[PDB]
From a paper:
[name]-GH18L crystallized in the P 6 5 space group with one molecule in the asymmetric unit and diffracted to a maximum resolution of 1.7 Å. The [name] domain (residues 61–349) adopts the conserved (β/α)8-barrel topology with an overall size of 45 × 46 × 38 Å. A large groove contains the active site. This groove is located at the center of the (β/α)8-barrel and surrounded by the loops connecting β1–α1 (loop 1; residues 70–90, pink), β2–α2 (loop 2; residues 105–111, brown), β3–α3 (loop 3; residues 143–157, orange), β4–α4 (loop 4; residues 185–190, light green), β5–α5 (loop 5; residues 223–227, blue), β6–α6 (loop 6; residues 244–248, green), β7–α7 (loop 7; residues 274–293, light blue), and β8–α8 (loop 8; residues 314–335, red). The floor of this groove is composed of a set of aromatic residues including Y67, W71, F104, Y245, and Y313. The crystal structure of the [name]-GH18L construct revealed that the linker region folds into two three α-helical bundle (3HB) domains connected by an additional α-helix. The first 3HB domain comprises helices α9, α10 and α11 (3HB-1; residues 350–395), whereas the second 3HB domain covers helices α13, α14, and α15 (3HB-2; residues 421–482). Both 3HB-1 and 3HB-2 domains are connected by a short α-helix, α12 (residues 409–417).
Here we focus on [name], a multi-modular glycoside hydrolase secreted by [name], one of the leading causes of healthcare-associated infections. We provide X-ray crystal structures of [name], which show an architecture composed of four domains, including [name] and GH20 glycoside hydrolases connected by two consecutive three α-helical bundles. Both glycoside hydrolase domains act in a concerted manner to process diverse N-glycans on glycoproteins, including therapeutic IgG antibodies.
Author numbering: 61 to 482
């Protein structure tokens, strides 16, 4: 029932080069790299005038590749429009008619959502609108609720995005939204409690989703939501508070900057991330038990052991998982503190929790026989061992990949047994 949302900066996708940035650095991720356990992805895009041609490959890829792929994983896509867009509703009289509100709601969805291959909409409200404005926005939001959000009967999200608790533009239409996304960058769970109290006349806690940020390059602002020790960080405190108090979930802004700082190196550089903090916040906000976290990590360690040749790092990771006392420490035991510092750059505990339900014991017995039938190759036909080593290395490599299906496992089982049965 809970939510975990991330804001994905479109101009930091690999398909964009030189959009909305003075940095020449190559982008390092695609939307395929978004971690598991994230059920809503907000595509946040700013395209400066003149860069529309540079940004088009991303939009084509979003519509034709990224959105189908994320839908296959159960993820829904949204994007935001500024509250001011609602106030441009055309009308003939002194105020719009029900039909004029409805006409405009359909126009908004077509332009900003449907044409992009996106599923739903956020309203970004970070001002203090007038009473005249709210008559307009109330009508437009009410008209939109027939098509998206809880009142529509559909699975299309309708979200309200804000960094304050300004009630007038919300209190008449709060029932139209799946949840409120509350930006509280830089602040701990004391602010989470206060903000929810202030919003409680119009919003229940289960539909309140607090959010933190990662440090953005070149930013004049300073919001420090990650730090070690882990339990001193805002990312622990807010994720824990959301879980402890049955809130709607959590969100994170700027997925691509997971682990970055505002130091002189990070402030002007685009670098790969092991996504440690996001993967940890997903687990923490859902209250994953330490036992379950360790079980997933040990599952990963065993399945990569047949292709991975670094026995020292595998051993240190297994020991570090055993000593871990926080969800962060389990993840860090495999991912390291930063990209390339651990045994893996891609381990994903939510993904791996899914794979626990697929039995590997038959495949492990087959691969173990193959390994035994390599250590004593001096006792067999080299023309048969070669056909086994080729098949074994292939299955080992694929078994250590991103993910696999139960049907895929039986295929590797048959392949390995066949090579041994000859
Ligand atoms: Cl639908
Ligand atoms: Cl839909
Ligand atoms: Zn927004
Ligand atoms: Zn639908
Ligand atoms: Zn990064
Ligand atoms: Zn990753």
């Amino acid at each position: 029932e809970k939510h975990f949302m991330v804001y994905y900066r479109a101009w930091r996708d690999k398909t964009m080069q030189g959009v909305n940035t003075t940095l020449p650095d190559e982008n390092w991720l695609t939307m395929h790299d978004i971690p598991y356990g994230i059920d809503i992805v907000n595509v946040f895009s700013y395209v400066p005038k003149g860069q529309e041609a540079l940004a088009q490959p991303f939009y084509d890829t979003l519509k034709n590749e990224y959105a189908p792929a994320l839908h296959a994983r159960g993820v829904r896509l949204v994007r935001g429009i500024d509250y001011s867009e609602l106030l441009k509703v055309p009308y003939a009289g002194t105020t719009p008619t029900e039909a004029e509100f409805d006409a405009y709601a359909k126009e908004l969805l077509t332009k900003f959502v449907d044409d992009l291959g996106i599923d739903g909409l956020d309203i970004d409200m970070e001002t203090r609108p007038s009473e005249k404005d709210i008559v307009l926005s109330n009508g437009v939001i009410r008209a939109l609720s027939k098509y998206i959000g809880p009142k529509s009967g559909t699975d299309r999200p309708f979200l309200y995005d804000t960094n304050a608790e300004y009630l007038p533009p919300l209190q008449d239409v709060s029932d139209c939204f799946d949840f409120l996304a509350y930006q509280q960058y830089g602040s701990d769970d004391k602010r989470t409690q206060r903000a929810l109290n202030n919003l409680s006349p119009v919003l229940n806690g289960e539909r309140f989703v607090p959010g933190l940020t990662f440090p953005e390059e070149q930013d004049r602002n300073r919001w420090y939501d990650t730090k070690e020790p882990y339990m001193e960080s805002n990312m622990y405190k807010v994720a824990r508070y959301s879980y402890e108090n049955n809130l709607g979930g959590m969100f994170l802004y700027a997925l691509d900057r997971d682990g970055r700082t505002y130091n002189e190196d990070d402030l002007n550089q685009i670098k790969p991330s092991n996504l440690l903090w996001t993967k940890t916040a997903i687990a923490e906000s859902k209250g994953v038990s330490l036992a379950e976290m360790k079980a997933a990590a040990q599952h990963y360690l065993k399945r990569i052991s047949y292709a991975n040749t670094d026995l020292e790092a595998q051993n240190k990771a297994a020991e570090t998982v055993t000593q871990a006392t926080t969800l962060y420490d389990v993840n860090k035991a495999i991912l390291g503190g930063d990209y390339g510092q651990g045994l893996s750059n891609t381990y994903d505990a939510e993904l791996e929790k899914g794979l626990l339900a697929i039995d590997l014991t038959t495949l492990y017995r087959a691969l173990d026989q193959a390994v035994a039938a390599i250590e004593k190759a001096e006792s067999y036909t080299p023309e048969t061992i070669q056909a086994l080593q080729t098949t074994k290395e292939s299955v080992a490599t694929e078994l250590a990949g991103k993910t696999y299906t139960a049907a895929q496992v039986t295929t590797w089982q048959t392949e390995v047994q066949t090579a041994l049965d000859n």
